[PDB]
């Protein structure tokens, strides 16, 4: 099988260098042009470029011409991206692409994202956020997580060990001053709560922080 | 001729040569030009420098 | 009494923002996009390799 | 260019003295002399072909004296 | 430098269905050689037409890619649950190769309000000398829909902190979190926290709130 | 084609110093063919001198036009009242003509804070339904200063208009009006009405405020 | 006495016409170039163009090339600055310049504001403006004149008829609503006030409105 | 197997946005800003007036 | 001066890029040419002479398109 496999992701610091890896897989290395394509977080695909896979001879477009260097293993058939001088803009996922070349790329390096930043590894701040009169809906009282603060992703929010999946929305961690926010909620009957514990259970591996906040009423 | 102001003053000049001036030249309102690069000159490549 | 400019001529010229897009052997025509804007002036060119 | 291909000469209305006069006059001869006279082994060899071909005396001297300013100018 | 654009943005649909995406090549005539991408979340992309005209070997006949140079249709006459997904159409005639803006596969269902559950500060919050109002928006189709932070009637865009779920795995809702961050200090300084939730199954913002003077 | 710039943009002087008003011709050389202009607000320009280093007729011998071709300078050694003006210098030597960013004289003196006033909607405008909190900052000097709305402690920059006299005549410091225009609904759904001025005499805003609920 | 004589300040409206006269006097018309500039209201001087004063040749600014007619009558020796397709950006006091050419333009046209939008005539709508124990600062209780809502400018605002100019800063007309406010502040002495009248006296000779406003305290 | 592009060619082309800015007799030099824009293509020339 | 008598050519070792090079090419023919492409009057009237003399054909050119480039700045 034909299978574009890359390196990992990579947290970064701004002003350093990554090389993405792509490994060549279930075919000949040097028949087909090997692409890369930045998935910006938010961007759709855009393609970063082709390096010639048989003179090993890198095109770029004239975005990603000059800070990235593309660069091709021959014998073990591995393909490379290398960004130099690492910007937060270098922060995204990135796909090397096989070309098909006049047809284009069929397959795709499994996702290489780069995270390019200052901020250091950091426990979050795990708020069990109770509900208020308004709060309870219907038999459900609405329950809630605020996980606060920490780098990098992710912290495992679960709920009562997870035993509770179902009113869960843990909500998406973004970005605070390169820490991670995230409130997580729980929508529990209030016939379970605070009859039955509802702890959420945020466990940031990053960190080696796991966190456990029953929800309390106010 | 044309009345053709070098430096501070101005100056005579048929205006049939006036055009034959082979010079970096002008709309002769503003901006967009006509061999600006006989003023100027390149390199060898060393590396991409030039 | 009155005169009005005919044309008008730059008879010094300063180079700006010299920039050099280098292509690989026989990738042909360079690209550097600054011919997209005339206030720059592009050179195609080659750049002599090992 | 700047240098070269003058207004020279305006030569309408004009007695008056021009914008650059004395140049004009001796532009010619002193440069082609100074080229020449910075060559002076180049001068000699004109003076042959004058001779050389056309044998008719005084129209052979056409050819040289011509051929002394060609060079300068080329 | 050529362009594509591929229309829509995202499509809630029926499984089964058919839910064309439309493309166009901005610029010569691409003729062939444009395709169909499609990513889920978190993916490598997957190819799915090639030529604009041909699927690839995985992707089964339900993915139809067509038109031809100036425009092109990326359709699946059963769009499918295992087709909700991002769809990509790239021009391959010329370098530079590039990608259309996308077209998603959304499932359409029943329109489903947000349950809209606003949490204080956590007095552990509280302790730490910050201060985030969070209110859950949960379980709403579609994904339509606004925050709007009031506080002491005069309403406060700052602080506000939004982390909403996808159309959601078991009713195909979307569920939201809207985070009011105050300083303690200005938590304390002003009183009603008032995050009103505007969905298109509301024709009002459906309103959530707490004075601080109340419990 | 050719771009000035005329520096400074004013400048506070004691009548009969020498102020020196720079301007430079951003293209070519002008050589000669640059010319200043006076122009006291609301009047025709003045033109002061001609190939930039020649006094007109009118214009007294206190100013010294000067500079050469790529830059030039208006020097009035003695800058006097009626030297106060909107000064500029224009190129000539190419179509287009143009300007340069104008320089002020302003007669310098001693810093005045402003004297802030601020009237609520009287009951003439408030019988009308509009409500405009208004803030007369009478006679600061300089003329740099910020106006700020607060309302129930929350600042408001709307319905705010702002009008100031100029350089005031005999204190020669500057005069404004500071305006807090409300719907009288909003005008009564809020309550404290403050404008708050901070001026370069005080390292603070003046505060000058009051509430509906106050007389 | 080279004077350039222009025609007044003309109200407009978006998609008239205007045609600016300039007369000039003082010079034997024919020998020097006219010169129109364009001076925005808040912005500097913006060089129109000029027209040959012989040939009746006009040539515009870039900006100003093909909305407008530089036109000359040569006996009357009348300059005209004329502006086609009335749009609120040719509202602005206009300069014919007489043209000491490659030296400047020497003279200028007294000054013509054309001022070209939609509104109607409106009388101004007057606050005696009361002050609170907020506004009186030492012996001076301020008082204000709050005009509001007319067009077009001016409106005349005095104090009591203006026998107070002494405390009195009158504020800038501004637009609101292609309307406009002035607001005059008087400061007078808490002695002189509400002891004596003071009374802003707002005169519109516009939309013909003379009012009085007795400022009496709250 | 794996190819390069030496260069492109617009077999067919699209005239879009015509505009000539036109200046009187012995104005010379015609003055059109879209000189500065090369997706512009510009051309002088004249109209002879009456 | 600036104008005319420029160090090119040096020739002395350098064996390089020049300072200007291609242009030096073009300054005999073109601004000769442009002056007689100016004066096509002197183009019509001056390569008759030659052939009016000596009567010796192939030669008879010699001063005639020679003669032409002579014209220009002398």
């Known amino acids: 099988q034909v299978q574009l496999m890359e390196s990992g992701p990579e947290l970064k610091k701004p002003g350093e260098t990554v090389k993405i890896s792509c490994?060549?897989?279930?075919?000949?290395?040097?028949?087909?042009?090997?692409?890369?394509v930045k998935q910006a977080p938010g961007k759709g695909l855009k393609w970063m470029g082709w390096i010639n896979t048989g003179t090993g001879e890198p095109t770029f477009a004239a975005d990603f011409k000059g800070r990235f260097a593309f660069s091709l293993e021959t014998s073990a058939s591995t393909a490379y991206l290398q960004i130099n001088n690492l910007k937060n803009e270098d922060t995204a996922s990135?796909?090397?692409?096989?070309?098909?070349?006049?047809?284009?790329?069929?397959?795709?390096?499994?996702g290489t994202s780069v995270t390019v930043s200052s901020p250091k590894t950091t426990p979050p701040s795990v708020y069990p956020l109770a509900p208020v009169c308004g709060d309870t809906t219907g038999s459900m009282v609405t329950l809630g997580c605020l996980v606060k603060g920490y780098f990098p992703e992710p912290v495992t929010v679960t709920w009562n060990s997870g035993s509770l999946s179902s009113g869960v929305h843990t909500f998406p961690a973004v970005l605070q001053s390169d820490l991670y926010t995230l409130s997580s909620s729980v929508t529990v009957p209030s016939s379970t709560w605070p009859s039955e514990t509802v702890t959420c259970n945020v466990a940031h591996p990053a960190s080696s922080t796991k966190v456990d906040k029953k929800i309390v009423p106010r | 001729f044309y009345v053709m102001t070098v430096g501070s003053k101005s100056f005579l000049v048929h205006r049939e040569w006036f055009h034959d001036l082979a010079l970096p030249w002008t709309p002769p309102s503003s901006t967009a030009w006509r061999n600006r690069e006989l003023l100027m000159e390149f390199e060898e490549a060393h590396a991409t420098k030039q | 009494s009155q005169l009005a400019e005919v044309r008008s001529y730059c008879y010094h010229a300063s180079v700006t923002d010299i920039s050099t897009v280098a292509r690989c052997p026989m990738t042909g025509e360079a690209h550097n996009e600054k011919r997209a804007d005339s206030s720059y002036v592009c050179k195609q060119g080659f750049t002599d390799r090992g | 260019s700047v240098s070269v291909q003058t207004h020279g000469e305006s030569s309408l209305v004009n007695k008056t003295e021009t914008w650059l006069d004395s140049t004009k006059a001796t532009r010619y001869l002193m440069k082609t002399e100074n080229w020449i006279i910075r060559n002076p082994g180049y001068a000699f060899l004109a003076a042959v072909l004058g001779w050389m071909l056309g044998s008719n005396n005084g129209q052979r001297v056409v050819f040289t004296i011509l051929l002394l300013l060609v060079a300068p100018a080329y | 430098d050529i362009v594509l654009t591929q229309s829509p943005a995202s499509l809630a649909v029926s499984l089964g269905q058919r839910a064309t995406i439309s493309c166009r090549a901005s610029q010569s005539v691409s003729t062939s050689y444009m395709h169909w991408y499609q990513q889920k979340p978190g993916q490598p992309p997957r190819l799915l037409i090639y030529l604009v005209s041909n699927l690839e070997s995985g992707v089964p006949s339900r993915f139809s890619g067509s038109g031809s140079g100036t425009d092109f249709t990326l359709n699946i006459h059963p769009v499918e649950a295992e087709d909700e997904a991002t769809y990509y159409c790239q021009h391959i005639r010329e370098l530079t190769r590039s990608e259309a803006g996308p077209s998603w596969l959304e499932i359409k269902r029943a329109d489903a309000a947000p349950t809209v559950s606003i949490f204080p500060p956590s007095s552990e919050q509280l302790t730490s000398g910050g201060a985030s109002v969070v209110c859950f928006l949960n379980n709403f189709y579609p994904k339509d829909i606004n925050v709007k932070w009031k506080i002491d009637g005069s309403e406060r865009q700052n602080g506000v902190l939004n982390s909403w779920t996808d159309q959601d795995s078991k009713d195909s809702t979307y569920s939201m979190s809207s985070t009011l961050t105050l300083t303690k200090d200005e938590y304390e300084r002003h009183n009603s926290y008032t995050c009103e939730a505007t969905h298109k199954t509301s024709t009002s913002p459906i309103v959530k709130s707490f004075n601080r003077n109340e419990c | 084609d050719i771009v000035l710039t005329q520096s400074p943009a004013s400048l506070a002087v004691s009548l009969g110093q020498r102020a020196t008003i720079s301007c430079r011709a951003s293209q070519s050389v002008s050589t000669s063919y640059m010319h200043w202009y006076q122009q006291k607000p609301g009047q025709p320009p003045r033109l002061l001198i001609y190939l930039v280093s020649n006094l007109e007729s009118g214009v007294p011998s206190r100013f010294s036009g000067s500079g050469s071709g790529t830059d030039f300078t208006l020097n009035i050694h003695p800058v006097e009242a009626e030297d106060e003006a909107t000064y500029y210098c224009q190129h000539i030597r190419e179509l287009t003509r143009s300007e340069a960013g104008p320089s002020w004289l302003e007669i310098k003196r001693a810093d005045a804070a402003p004297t802030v006033s601020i009237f609520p909607p009287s009951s003439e405008q408030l019988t009308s339904g509009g409500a405009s909190v208004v803030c007369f900052l009478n006679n600061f000097y300089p003329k740099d200063i910020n106006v700020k709305w607060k309302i129930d402690g929350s600042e408001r920059q709307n319905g705010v208009l702002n009008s100031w006299t100029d350089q005031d005549s005999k204190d020669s410091t500057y005069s404004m009006s500071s305006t807090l225009t409300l719907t009288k609904d909003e005008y009564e759904r809020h309550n404290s009405y403050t404008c708050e001025a901070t001026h370069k005499t005080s390292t603070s805003p003046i505060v000058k405020s009051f509430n509906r609920n106050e007389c | 006495q080279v004077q350039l004589m222009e025609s007044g300040p003309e109200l407009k409206k978006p998609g008239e016409t205007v045609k600016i006269s300039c007369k000039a006097s003082?010079?034997?018309?024919?020998?020097?170039?006219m010169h129109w500039v364009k001076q925005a209201p808040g912005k500097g001087l913006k060089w129109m163009g000029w027209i040959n004063t012989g040939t009746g040749e006009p040539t515009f600014a870039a900006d100003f090339k093909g909305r407008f007619a530089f036109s000359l009558e040569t006996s009357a020796s009348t300059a005209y600055l004329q502006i086609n397709n009335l749009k609120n950006e040719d509202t602005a006091s206009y300069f014919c310049?007489?043209?000491?050419?490659?030296?400047?333009?020497?003279?200028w046209g007294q000054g013509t504001s054309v001022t070209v939008s939609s509104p109607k005539t409106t009388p101004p709508s007057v606050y005696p403006l009361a002050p609170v124990c907020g506004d009186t600062t030492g012996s001076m209780v301020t008082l204000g004149c709050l005009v509001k809502g007319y067009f077009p400018e001016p409106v005349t605002v005095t104090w009591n008829s203006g026998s107070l100019s002494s405390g009195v800063h009158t504020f800038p007309a501004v637009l609101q609503s292609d309307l406009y406010t002035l607001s005059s502040s008087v400061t007078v002495p808490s002695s002189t006030w509400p002891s004596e009248t003071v009374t802003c006296n707002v005169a519109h000779p516009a939309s013909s409105t003379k009012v009085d406003k007795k400022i009496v305290p709250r | 197997s794996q190819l390069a592009e030496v260069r492109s060619y617009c077999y067919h082309a699209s005239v879009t946005d015509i505009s000539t800015v036109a200046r009187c007799p012995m104005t010379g030099e015609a003055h059109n800003e879209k000189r500065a824009d090369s997706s512009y293509v510009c051309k002088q020339g004249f109209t002879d007036r009456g | 001066s600036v104008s005319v008598q420029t160090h090119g050519e040096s020739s002395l070792v350098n064996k390089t890029e020049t300072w200007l090079d291609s242009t030096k090419a073009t300054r005999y023919l073109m601004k000769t040419e442009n002056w007689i492409i100016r004066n096509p009057g002197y183009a019509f009237l001056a390569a008759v002479l030659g052939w009016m003399l000596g009567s010796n054909n192939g030669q008879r050119v010699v001063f005639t398109i020679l003669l032409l480039l002579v014209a220009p700045a002398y």
């Open positions: 003082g010079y034997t018309f024919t020998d020097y170039s």
């Open positions: 310049a007489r043209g000491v050419g490659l030296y400047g333009v020497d003279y």
